[PDB]
Ligand binder design. Structure first.
Ligand SMILES: O=C(N1CCOCC1)N1CCC=C(F)C1
Length: 185
């Protein structure tokens, strides 16, 4: 791909984080803590899952960023509406305002309803995310495999401002403690 020139500097919004998350001082890394992180509750925090939003809001144009997923067993990545549900149980789908992919139990899937099997020969260590607001496109790229396409959501109906979306996943296995990291430009 040739989307790298739309690179944007994403930072994580502490106020939206699940209360177990630990966000680095530079707001560029997030991981699952082993306990509640001693923060107050608020209506923005994702309550049921280890999720957090980027601070940036996008309503036009083309945007690109990269995320490091090295040695994780489970995670979700993509974008979502600013107005997504924060409390209780929900599925990741475009109907619920999410455009995402994930790793779970050794398979990669796109967050359609129902979910779509992805075909990845080279397990990625870094993921590129491209959003074209006007075109209604969200695309995912395998940076480990020379930028190869993973998945494109087209005919997207954003229906609001978009925020970068992250899920570090649970760590029931003891093998998923590693952080998500926003990679430098
Ligand atoms: O219930 C948990 N868990 C963490 C410990 O392991 C069990 C699952 N929480 C609270 C709700 C959302 C979270 F991210 C963390």
């Amino acid at each position: 791909h040739h989307h790298h020139h739309h690179m944007v500097h994403i930072t994580l919004d502490r106020n939206t984080a699940n209360s177990w998350l630990i966000i680095s001082k530079d707001r560029r890394q997030v991981r699952m803590g082993d306990t509640h992180q001693n923060v107050s509750d608020n209506k923005e925090r994702f309550s049921n899952y280890p999720m957090v939003l980027g601070a940036q809001r996008f309503s036009s144009g083309k945007m690109y960023w990269e995320v490091d997923v090295t040695q994780k067993e489970a995670w979700d990545l993509g974008v979502c509406r600013d107005s997504v549900q924060r409390k209780g149980q929900f599925s990741l789908s475009p109907e619920n305002g999410f455009w995402t992919i994930w790793l779970w139990q050794d398979s990669y899937e796109a967050g359609t309803s129902p979910q779509t099997t992805l075909h990845i020969q080279v397990p990625p260590c870094q993921i590129g995310i491209f959003v074209d607001y006007e075109a209604g496109v969200v695309s995912f790229y395998n940076i480990t495999d020379h930028g190869s396409l993973i998945y494109t959501f087209s005919e997207c109906v954003f229906a609001g401002p978009l925020r970068p979306f992250f899920n570090v996943g649970f760590n029931y296995s003891g093998g998923n403690a590693a952080p998500l990291k926003l990679c430098p430009l």
